[PDB]
C-alpha cells in the first residue's frame, strides 16, 4: 500500500479537473483516497469469494 499510494496522487494532481486551481493538490488527494476505497472494496469481495 505504501508503494502504490505515493505514485497515484500524481496523475490526479497534475492532470485532474481542478489542476490549475489553488486547491488542486487537495483535490488530488481526495481523488486518490476515493480510488483506494474502490480497490479496497475489490480486495474484500475477492477474499470472500
Amino acid at each position: 500500500g505504501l508503494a502504490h499510494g505515493y505514485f497515484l496522487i500524481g496523475p490526479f494532481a497534475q492532470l485532474g479537473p481542478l489542476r490549475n486551481s489553488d486547491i488542486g493538490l487537495l483535490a488530488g488527494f481526495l481523488s486518490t483516497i476515493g480510488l483506494i476505497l474502490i480497490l479496497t472494496l475489490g480486495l474484500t469481495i475477492y477474499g470472500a469469494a
Binding site: 481542478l18 489553488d22 476505497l37 479496497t40
Partner: protein, 185 residues
C-alpha cells in the same frame, strides 16, 4: 410485539445479511447508538458556533472557479461556506470510521461479527446479555449496559427533536437552543 419473533422473522427473510449482524440486532443498536450520542455533540457545537458567529465568513458561496461544478447547488449557484465547513468536519470523522471498519485491531469491536476476528466470542457474549426493555441499573459506570442505555436515549432524542421542530415549525438548531435555555443564541 414480543420483539423476538419479529427479529427471527427478519433473519429468516434476509438470512445472508443477518449472519454478519446487519438488521435488527444488538450490534446495530450499539453502533447506531454510539453514532447518535456522538452526533448530539456535533449538533450542539454547530448551534453554538452559529449563535456565537464562530464559523468564518458564513453566508457566502464558494467560488465556482476555485472549486468546481461539484460545488453547485443549481446552475452556477454554489454551496455556502457554512454548510461546506460542517460537511468537512463530518468528513474528518467519517474517515476515522472507515479506517476502523477496513483495518480493525485485534482487540477492537468490529462493526460486523466476523468468525475470523479474535473478538468474535466476546462480542457474541456481550450482545447475548445486553437485551432488555428497561435499563439495568447496578451496572452503572463504564459498562456495555450503560453504553446501550445511553445510546437508545440519544437516538430517541433525535426523533423527538425532529418532531418538535416540525410541530413548532422551527429549525432543529432552534429547538436545541430552546431546550438548552437559549444559551447558544
Amino acid at each position: 410485539s414480543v420483539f423476538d419473533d419479529a427479529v427471527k422473522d427478519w433473519a429468516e427473510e434476509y438470512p445472508q445479511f443477518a449472519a454478519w449482524g446487519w438488521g435488527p440486532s444488538v450490534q446495530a443498536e450499539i453502533w447506531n447508538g454510539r453514532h447518535a450520542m456522538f452526533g448530539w455533540v456535533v449538533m450542539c457545537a454547530c448551534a453554538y458556533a452559529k449563535g456565537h458567529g464562530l464559523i468564518p465568513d458564513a453566508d457566502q458561496t464558494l467560488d465556482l472557479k476555485e472549486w468546481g461544478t461539484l460545488a453547485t447547488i443549481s446552475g452556477k449557484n454554489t454551496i455556502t461556506n457554512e454548510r461546506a465547513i460542517i460537511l468537512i468536519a463530518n468528513v474528518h470523522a467519517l474517515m476515522v470510521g472507515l479506517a476502523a471498519t477496513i483495518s480493525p485491531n485485534s482487540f477492537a469491536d468490529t462493526l460486523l461479527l466476523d468468525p475470523n476476528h479474535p473478538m468474535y466470542e466476546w462480542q457474541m457474549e456481550r450482545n447475548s446479555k445486553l437485551g432488555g426493555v428497561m435499563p439495568n441499573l447496578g451496572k452503572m459506570g463504564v459498562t456495555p449496559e450503560a453504553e446501550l442505555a445511553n445510546g437508545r436515549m440519544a437516538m430517541m432524542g433525535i426523533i423527538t427533536c425532529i418532531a418538535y421542530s416540525g410541530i413548532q415549525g422551527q429549525s432543529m438548531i432552534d429547538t436545541i437552543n430552546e431546550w438548552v435555555g437559549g444559551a447558544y443564541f
